[PDB]
Design a binder for this molecule. Sequence first.
Ligand code: J5Q
Length: 138
Amino acid sequence: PLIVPYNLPLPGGVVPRMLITILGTVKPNANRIALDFQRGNDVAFHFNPRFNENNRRVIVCNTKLDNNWGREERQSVFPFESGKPFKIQVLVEPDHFKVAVNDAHLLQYNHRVKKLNEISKLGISGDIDLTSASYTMI
Ligand SMILES: Cc1ccc(S[C@@H]2O[C@H](CO)[C@H](O)[C@H](n3cc(-c4cccc(F)c4)nn3)[C@H]2O)cc1
């Protein structure tokens, strides 16, 4: 029952072996969800499930620099379901964010923004009921 859009500060930025866990439930008839790992106004890693992009469900990932979106990376494996509870785990590895949903590996996103210690907040937005958002070291 956290309020969305939600800002999760990441004190001191991200570092390899930091694991972010998001628990929530997708709203009925959802259209979109987004996670935004932010470096100030820049978005180092945008993770964006789209439930109806031309009648397809797709995960779009990208980076926003100086207000410009870059090259999209797309994944048609789509583990989210309207009305149902999910877990997203984002593990920071040296060279990528590694994302698992409901305990199944989903995708990796190579670091475009390389000042990891400056990626010091995570925004969570879109068509979910947000249960919890936290981090720990593994
Ligand atoms: C040249 C051009 C034209 C169109 C577009 S479309 C754009 O694509 C981005 C990824 O490349 C990103 O998804 C962006 N976006 C989504 C949300 C968003 C906000 C609240 C909830 C949510 F679930 C998602 N905020 N910004 C979207 O507007 C991009 C480039």
